[PDB]
Amino acid sequence: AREALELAIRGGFHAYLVGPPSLGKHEALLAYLSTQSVETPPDLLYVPLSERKVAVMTLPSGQEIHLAEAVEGLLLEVNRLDELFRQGSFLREKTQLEARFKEAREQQLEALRREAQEAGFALGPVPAELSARLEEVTLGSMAASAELEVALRRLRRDWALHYLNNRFEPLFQRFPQARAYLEALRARLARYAETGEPLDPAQWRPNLLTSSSSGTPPPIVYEPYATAPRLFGRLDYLVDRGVWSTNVSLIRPGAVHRAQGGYLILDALSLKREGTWEAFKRALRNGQVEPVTEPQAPAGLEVEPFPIQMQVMLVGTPEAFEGLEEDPAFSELFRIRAEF
Amino acid sequence: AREALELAIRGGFHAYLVGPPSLGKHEALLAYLSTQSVETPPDLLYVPLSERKVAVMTLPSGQEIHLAEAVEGLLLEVNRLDELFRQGSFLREKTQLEARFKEAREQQLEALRREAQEAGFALGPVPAELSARLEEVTLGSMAASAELEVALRRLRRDWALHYLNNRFEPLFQRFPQARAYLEALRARLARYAETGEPLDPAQWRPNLLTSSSSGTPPPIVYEPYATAPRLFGRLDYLVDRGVWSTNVSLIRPGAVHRAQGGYLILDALSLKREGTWEAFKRALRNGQVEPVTEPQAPAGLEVEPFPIQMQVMLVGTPEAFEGLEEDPAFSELFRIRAEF
Amino acid sequence: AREALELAIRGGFHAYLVGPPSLGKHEALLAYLSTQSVETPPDLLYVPLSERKVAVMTLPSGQEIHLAEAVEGLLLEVNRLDELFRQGSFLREKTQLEARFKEAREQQLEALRREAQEAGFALGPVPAELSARLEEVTLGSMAASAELEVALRRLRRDWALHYLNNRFEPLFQRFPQARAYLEALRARLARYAETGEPLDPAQWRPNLLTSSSSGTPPPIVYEPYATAPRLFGRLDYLVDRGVWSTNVSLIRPGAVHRAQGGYLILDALSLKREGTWEAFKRALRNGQVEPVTEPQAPAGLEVEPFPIQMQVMLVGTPEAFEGLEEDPAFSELFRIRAEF
Amino acid sequence: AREALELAIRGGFHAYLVGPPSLGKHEALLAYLSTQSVETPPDLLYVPLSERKVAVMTLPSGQEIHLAEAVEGLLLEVNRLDELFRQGSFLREKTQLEARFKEAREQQLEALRREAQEAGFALGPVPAELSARLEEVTLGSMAASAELEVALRRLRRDWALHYLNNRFEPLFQRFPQARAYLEALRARLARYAETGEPLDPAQWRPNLLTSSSSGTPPPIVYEPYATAPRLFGRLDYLVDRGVWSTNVSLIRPGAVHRAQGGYLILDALSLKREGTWEAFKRALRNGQVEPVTEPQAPAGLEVEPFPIQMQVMLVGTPEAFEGLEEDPAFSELFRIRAEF
Amino acid sequence: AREALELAIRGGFHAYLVGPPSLGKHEALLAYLSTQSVETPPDLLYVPLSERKVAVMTLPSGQEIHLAEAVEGLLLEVNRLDELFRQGSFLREKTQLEARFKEAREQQLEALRREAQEAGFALGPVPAELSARLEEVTLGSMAASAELEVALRRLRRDWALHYLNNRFEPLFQRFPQARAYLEALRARLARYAETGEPLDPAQWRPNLLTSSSSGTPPPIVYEPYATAPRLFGRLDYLVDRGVWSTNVSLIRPGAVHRAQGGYLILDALSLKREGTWEAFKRALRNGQVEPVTEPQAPAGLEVEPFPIQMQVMLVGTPEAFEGLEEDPAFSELFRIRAEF
Amino acid sequence: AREALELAIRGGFHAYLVGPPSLGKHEALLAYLSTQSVETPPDLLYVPLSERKVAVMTLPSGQEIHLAEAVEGLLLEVNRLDELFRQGSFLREKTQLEARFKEAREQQLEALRREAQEAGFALGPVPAELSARLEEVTLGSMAASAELEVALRRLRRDWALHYLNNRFEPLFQRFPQARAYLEALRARLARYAETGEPLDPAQWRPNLLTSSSSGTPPPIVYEPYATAPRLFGRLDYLVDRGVWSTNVSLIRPGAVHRAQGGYLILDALSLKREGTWEAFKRALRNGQVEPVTEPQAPAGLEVEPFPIQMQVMLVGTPEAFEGLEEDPAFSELFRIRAEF
């Protein structure tokens, strides 16, 4: 009874608690677990490495709130980049290379103008094969033109990175686990500099899944209703007019996200009724799971599978277990049985 | 005389050799140096991290030929990527998600068609505010359409990287110094997969500057004609029609590139006649230099400065040195004077 | 055709070759593969950590022959241990502590003898409660006796380890990957010292599975007959009289063992006919497999799963593939299809 | 005087204090030293790696109390292992392999029974060489029987280690210096699982020798009575009936154990009177010493020598030193002499 | 205005603030900066590696006060060394080797005395070539004499280092960055032992340049008067009678020393009036500067250049900047311009 | 016999071979050992860290010849330093600071000369307290004079180290174990620069003790005559006139030096006859020994103890061992006894 339960707690083990038909057995296991304590759990959370790609991040317990606050500051850095490009020192480097490209165009124009022989500046007949020369200058002016747009972009980029490396340097040393994510944000702010294309905060913020936990009391989730979305989390979508979209902030946590580092108490009967035993088995066997998506939605995300790091306690009556007990994988995963 | 010279050789020192008006003093210093030997020099070379950005790479002596051969193989990998996208397993993943996007469009079309009330399929009057519904479907079909192009790109990309990581893995372990450059090539082949846009070999190949050297005999360059381009190298350009362009293969080595790890014998008189003392001073003081460009060309490269790693021997007559000798920086850089 | 095949070879990929009914298609793929070369494969082999437990060892290519030769020498070390216990220096430490235990017994005997009052040495009536004293001495002599056997064992052990650490020290530095296995052998020789119980060479030798390979030509196995034992290896047993037994030398290699680092050419039809598709799928998915045992044999081994490190080429006719092609896992594992 | 003493304290030095015949000179040196402070001393303690082998452990100051508390918890884990073997999931693996061995015996019995020709089941004449067959089955049933006991042990072991690795993992990371000792305890609990043989707490607990010390005030021991056991500690024995025994908890600390990290004030006269100068000299020279045993006791321990890590101050009158002063080793060890 | 300023603060940037003729613009920038906070600055300070050589040391913020206190204790260690050489154990090693050298002299004297043939001890005629023998003994006695002084020095040295290594060991582990400096002090105390030559505290103490700073508020220096000595610090000299001298304690901090880790507010007009723009430019470009010396003083120090680690804000009116604004290096260094 | 011997060889063990009175038993053990092979022995040698201090160096087998050749080159570097100080660039820095000190003296002289009031340049009466001023200038000129000698030394030193660091840099990377010794040589060449005091090659060369050995055949020394100097090596002395001296080249190797990595065959009888059993015991117990010196020589060296790294085989007749056999330390060190 209590001994089997203590054994489950002390061992690594997933367990199942078997009791009489009376209800609220969950609310007694809960009271019991909430007097224990566990090893401090890290913060596990989702972050966007791009608009489409979402990774799992692990931070020391308590640090995720601070990263999120730091990210809100980085988003406002677009206003600082704007002011940076109003500075005279930048405007001077800028016109300086503009003149470099005016010069090249407006000399090949003056070499094309010294056709005082048969032409007179456009803005004969006949041509005379200086007709080719006209194309040289045209094609060349368009090429110098695109080459100038690019060089301005590269210029804005370089200035932007000079400024941004000062903002980011403290962050890398404060959040070494967030390194790839901070690099992704830095690149994206650099692209705002090149392009002027504004950031949607909702595509770039970290998605904190649960509150940080000391371990005392342990994280504990009771799930009476075991659907796939409630166990595994789900991805929501925005449909504005006819347009579908989605982003990292639209991932909604399930029990595996909220119970990280702790205990997940699950109603067994509900697990059977719902589709979910087979998928639950797979999740436990693999150590990870993805959030539920709507198959055949015209929008999507590449989401890293979320690791399973909790201990599961199934609750039910003998009758409730009988369907489960006849599967050989049941006792392989749920080694300990506990009573009353 | 010989002692001062030995002293220069054994010490780290830049020197100057002072001799009578008779010519071929260079061809005697050369004969002398070519009996010495030096520490094995690494291969120093230029590689493109992008079409516009060029970095310096250091490889163990002899390895650059092998990297260059490996790069020629990587360039031909575009043909392998082509065959990869003719595979049934890929075509099936491809049509599979095509159908996913046809489904979404051609159901919202059938929901838009059940306006048998006042419409009849286009391909009244009046509208009736199902007019808005028509736009939902249009805007939504265009969005699903762009979302599909992107997802195909991401699909081709992912397949491409699966294949390319097998080709690149041996290279990273064989050429750990070439890591950033190999990553740049891998990304570029991945983009050929996304885009179909072919690679210009000349933009992506490493530019080997000198033959590898054992150190015996040492690398030795004699430069009788001390212009900036011949000392520091230069960047060439292609002008085809009126269009200017340039790339990493158009960097032409100077003496600082060819004398790496060894000796640069320089005619002193020529250094004075030409513009070049001031720039030479700067190069030595800074430990690095860039190749000469045509200022105000409408095309350019971002080129990492090339490190100076040679020992310089100035050759001349007493008269030839007098202009140099009156500069305080002269003897600071050229500590040793040698005779005859 | 050749292109798809080259693609399979250059990529990491498992492939399948589809051809006309004509036979010997295998002998042509073989001729082709045997002109390639692969990265040098490590030696993968089975070693016993105990009489019952078998682990996988990885050695640099070519080193396994040398370990096996070293192990043959270690087995003969039992003869050296025998001579060690014939040495006077050891015999003296030995009798020295024998006397220490004779002393303790044969003084408590002389304290028990000074019952000249009512006794006379055994080897009244009545007893007189010196009856308890008789038991003290008995129980005490038996305890001192067992304590002496143990101390002799500990003595032989310590001497044995002094000698054996000199033999083993070069081995640890020559074969750092073999460390746990060498420790197991050292402990077992130490136990021969304690116990006199001889070693069965067949329980302690490493089981080399294939000849070492440079990579040129690659390891290549053709398997026309795809039973579980021939793919995965098997465990044999000795039944001498009615007694069952087994050991690490009775593991027989299959194709996954012989094709390590190279290519496994497999007849597709045979894979279907035999039980084996499902188990083959599992092996590939898991990256590892165990050798086949006779279920319900009264003897067994704990065998570490052997990693799969080969590239598989399925050979067949279109007809031969049709049963396979209708499984979604087929093309997931066999990405590349090649012709003729 | 005070200067020589300060010099002794500040230097590393063993010293001797020479004073008038008046008593309580120790109680004045003590008052003085107890105002100083020293570098924080680690906890040095004895732990059992087996029932017979005792090692020295070093822990950060204050951590030994916590290890000892953790060890008390590990000892009670035998109760948890008991409950573990009452679990249905374990009982099922257990009968499962019991049946595997019943099957093998009770089929070879039915093959032995089909001697309906000349036999009739035992539980002719004559034999007929099926007499050999009877032995096959007997010898084979005994072998299958022993093989079953072993397999049950191995089974209990494996389950036990699954559970115990969860209990031990936090300990290894909390007490990395205690690693060998925790491994020894884990193995011993695993053997309780195999065997049912209970642990004697007194053989497995760490033996804390002194209270932890901050360094302020320093550890200080005054020893007026310099026998070998009081300086070096001793090993006690239990003699219950006639049986001798001993264990790690029966080691009694001496001054070298209690003064670790600090000062040992020693009466010089007493050092002379007692046997102990020669042994004290040796201890200091070697940096270590073992506790005193009763030579020729029929029980013993293998005890790692305990390091000497204190500074010694000899106290006496001029007369008291004269016997010591005439030994050349005296001043080599006691460099500083201090007065009054 | 405020935005440009925030931009300067958040970026790494040197800035200049342009305002109306009204005074106290500095006292407003100051009020503003003193509400910010910066990353904790290390302690940067000057330490003497010898009487003539001065290095820069970096310590964790707050640790320099503790090193300085530790150094004051090390200086007083000369008194402890004095007492050490009054110890009998040392005096005995000392006379012991004195006798060894008396013996050698006063036996070769007794071999020189056994010229009872023609001599009689000095303190004939004629000589007789025992005249050479007289010189042997003389030259030999002088050599044994110098060899004895040296051996006494080496003796005092060795004793001194035995004692000093106990004092220094805690310091090396407490101040690992101060390692070279502590080694220099240890050697110097060892030389006091050899030589008796006392230490001048002023030559050996660390020279703390500013108070340690948490970063809140940031270090801020306002410099209205921009002379070279006030910006860069200066070296003072002592002239006592006609004798010039100087030492590490005579280096006087300038603004670059006091503003380390923070902000240096500088009056622009004053920078122009004084000699100092050119030297300031150089300092910023190089990242370091040396303190001002009196050229052609007959005393000097070898002083490591002090790194520049502050952010500079120039203050002035438009008019005040015009002279500066026309230098291309101005805007290269002062990227941000701020108003009012 | 052979078995005991093989046992000794295979184990780590010191042994003793007991045989009949017939002679040449050594020459048979020798023949036997010279067919074996041992682990490659490092080169163990003596190097001078100063004129008085000698350390043990360990080099990879074969490298000591190369270090010795490198050292011969370093000794000749004094000739290169001479030429360096004949260079104009150095002479100019030199007179430059000479003038700086002439200036200071010959201005305070001209300030002392403007006593045209009551003086007239020396080279009244009465004085007039400008008498003090005369002393200021004198004392000041002497101080400026000594300060100049020092500054020239520091100047020569700095130039010398610039040159020498180029010569030494390859050596540090080629001989990382020789680091302290190379540093000592570099400092000594730097002092030749400061001082002009020539180096005695014999005080600075490494003293190679034995030829390098592959291990096949093993190093083997037979010692029939077991005096202390022949076992342990000795220090020689030079007595030129009456002056005693000694240096690292005057250390003469004994058997422990020549048998390093191998076998030392020792006549047992000779060990008894000579003083040497007690000292031999000590050497083995300590793992190291020093070479024999003449006690009470007026010259000496501080010599690091040389490690013992050989296996010892004592040879004799039963009679020869009897004196040894009765010492308890005998069999502790010589565990194995072998016959015939």
Side-chain angles (χ1 to χ4, degrees), chain B residues 43-67:
Chain B
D43 294 331
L44 296 167
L45 50 336
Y46 276 132
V47 302
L49 304 170
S50 79
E51 302 99 343
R52 159 133 194 145
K53 189 172 171 171
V54 173
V56 178
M57 191 178 279
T58 311
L59 286 183
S61 181
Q63 286 291 112
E64 71 176 355
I65 267 297
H66 297 308
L67 181 62

Coordinates of all heavy atoms in Angstrom, one line a residue, chain B residues 43-67:
Chain B
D43 N 50.3 26.2 -45.0 CA 49.7 26.8 -46.2 C 48.8 28.0 -45.8 O 47.8 27.7 -45.1 CB 48.8 25.8 -47.0 CG 49.7 24.6 -47.6 OD1 50.9 24.8 -47.9 OD2 49.1 23.5 -47.7
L44 N 49.1 29.2 -46.2 CA 48.1 30.3 -46.0 C 47.5 30.6 -47.3 O 48.1 30.8 -48.4 CB 48.9 31.6 -45.6 CG 49.5 31.5 -44.2 CD1 50.5 32.6 -43.9 CD2 48.4 31.4 -43.1
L45 N 46.1 30.7 -47.3 CA 45.4 30.8 -48.5 C 44.1 31.6 -48.3 O 43.6 31.8 -47.2 CB 45.1 29.5 -49.2 CG 44.5 28.2 -48.7 CD1 44.7 27.9 -47.2 CD2 43.1 27.9 -49.2
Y46 N 43.4 32.0 -49.4 CA 42.2 32.7 -49.4 C 41.0 31.8 -49.7 O 41.1 31.1 -50.7 CB 42.1 33.9 -50.4 CG 42.7 35.2 -49.8 CD1 43.6 35.9 -50.6 CD2 42.4 35.7 -48.6 CE1 44.2 37.1 -50.1 CE2 42.9 36.9 -48.1 CZ 43.8 37.6 -48.9 OH 44.4 38.7 -48.4
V47 N 40.0 31.9 -48.9 CA 38.8 31.1 -49.2 C 37.5 32.0 -49.1 O 37.5 32.9 -48.3 CB 38.5 29.9 -48.3 CG1 39.7 29.0 -48.5 CG2 38.3 30.3 -46.8
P48 N 36.5 31.7 -49.9 CA 35.3 32.5 -49.9 C 34.3 32.0 -48.9 O 33.9 30.8 -48.9 CB 34.7 32.3 -51.3 CG 35.2 30.8 -51.6 CD 36.6 30.8 -51.1
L49 N 33.9 32.8 -47.9 CA 32.8 32.4 -47.0 C 31.4 32.7 -47.6 O 30.4 32.2 -47.2 CB 32.9 32.9 -45.6 CG 34.2 32.7 -44.9 CD1 34.4 33.5 -43.6 CD2 34.4 31.2 -44.5
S50 N 31.5 33.6 -48.6 CA 30.3 33.8 -49.4 C 30.8 34.3 -50.7 O 32.0 34.5 -50.9 CB 29.3 34.8 -48.7 OG 29.8 36.2 -48.9
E51 N 29.8 34.7 -51.6 CA 30.2 35.3 -52.9 C 30.9 36.7 -52.7 O 31.7 37.1 -53.6 CB 28.9 35.6 -53.7 CG 28.1 34.3 -54.0 CD 26.9 34.1 -53.1 OE1 26.9 34.8 -52.0 OE2 26.0 33.3 -53.5
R52 N 30.7 37.3 -51.6 CA 31.3 38.6 -51.3 C 32.4 38.6 -50.3 O 33.3 39.5 -50.3 CB 30.2 39.6 -51.1 CG 30.6 40.9 -50.4 CD 30.1 42.2 -51.0 NE 30.8 43.3 -50.5 CZ 31.1 44.4 -51.2 NH1 30.8 44.5 -52.5 NH2 31.7 45.4 -50.6
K53 N 32.4 37.6 -49.4 CA 33.3 37.7 -48.2 C 34.5 36.6 -48.4 O 34.2 35.5 -48.6 CB 32.5 37.4 -47.0 CG 33.2 37.6 -45.6 CD 32.2 37.5 -44.5 CE 32.8 37.5 -43.1 NZ 31.8 37.6 -42.0
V54 N 35.7 37.1 -48.2 CA 36.9 36.2 -48.3 C 37.7 36.2 -47.1 O 38.1 37.3 -46.6 CB 37.8 36.8 -49.5 CG1 39.1 36.0 -49.6 CG2 37.0 36.8 -50.8
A55 N 37.9 35.0 -46.6 CA 38.8 34.8 -45.4 C 40.1 34.2 -45.7 O 40.3 33.5 -46.7 CB 38.0 34.0 -44.4
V56 N 41.0 34.4 -44.8 CA 42.3 33.7 -44.7 C 42.2 32.4 -44.0 O 41.6 32.2 -42.9 CB 43.3 34.5 -43.9 CG1 44.7 33.8 -43.8 CG2 43.6 35.9 -44.6
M57 N 42.8 31.3 -44.6 CA 42.8 30.0 -44.0 C 44.2 29.6 -43.8 O 45.1 29.8 -44.7 CB 42.1 29.1 -44.9 CG 42.0 27.8 -44.1 SD 41.0 26.5 -45.2 CE 39.2 27.3 -44.8
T58 N 44.4 28.9 -42.7 CA 45.7 28.3 -42.4 C 45.5 26.8 -42.3 O 44.7 26.3 -41.6 CB 46.3 28.8 -41.0 OG1 46.2 30.2 -41.0 CG2 47.7 28.3 -40.8
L59 N 46.4 26.1 -43.1 CA 46.3 24.6 -43.2 C 47.7 24.1 -42.9 O 48.7 24.8 -43.1 CB 45.8 24.2 -44.5 CG 44.3 24.3 -44.8 CD1 44.0 23.8 -46.2 CD2 43.5 23.7 -43.8
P60 N 47.8 22.9 -42.4 CA 49.2 22.2 -42.3 C 49.8 22.1 -43.7 O 49.1 21.8 -44.6 CB 48.9 20.8 -41.6 CG 47.5 21.0 -41.0 CD 46.8 22.0 -41.7
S61 N 51.1 22.3 -43.7 CA 51.8 22.3 -45.0 C 51.6 21.1 -45.8 O 51.8 19.9 -45.4 CB 53.3 22.4 -44.7 OG 54.0 22.5 -45.9
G62 N 51.1 21.3 -47.1 CA 50.7 20.3 -48.0 C 49.2 20.0 -48.1 O 48.8 19.3 -49.0
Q63 N 48.4 20.4 -47.1 CA 47.0 20.0 -47.1 C 46.1 20.7 -48.0 O 44.9 20.3 -48.3 CB 46.4 20.0 -45.6 CG 46.9 18.9 -44.7 CD 46.4 17.5 -45.1 OE1 47.1 16.7 -45.5 NE2 45.1 17.3 -44.9
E64 N 46.5 21.9 -48.6 CA 45.7 22.8 -49.4 C 45.3 22.2 -50.7 O 44.2 22.4 -51.2 CB 46.3 24.2 -49.5 CG 47.5 24.3 -50.4 CD 48.0 25.8 -50.5 OE1 47.3 26.7 -50.0 OE2 49.1 26.0 -51.2
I65 N 46.3 21.5 -51.4 CA 46.0 20.8 -52.6 C 44.9 19.8 -52.4 O 44.0 19.6 -53.2 CB 47.4 20.1 -53.1 CG1 48.1 21.0 -54.1 CG2 47.2 18.7 -53.6 CD1 47.3 21.3 -55.4
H66 N 44.8 19.1 -51.2 CA 43.8 18.1 -50.9 C 42.5 18.7 -50.7 O 41.5 18.1 -51.2 CB 44.3 17.2 -49.8 CG 45.6 16.4 -50.1 ND1 45.7 15.6 -51.3 CD2 46.8 16.2 -49.4 CE1 46.9 15.1 -51.3 NE2 47.6 15.4 -50.2
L67 N 42.4 19.8 -50.0 CA 41.1 20.6 -49.8 C 40.6 21.0 -51.2 O 39.4 20.9 -51.4 CB 41.3 21.8 -48.9 CG 40.1 22.6 -48.7 CD1 39.0 21.8 -48.0 CD2 40.4 23.9 -47.9

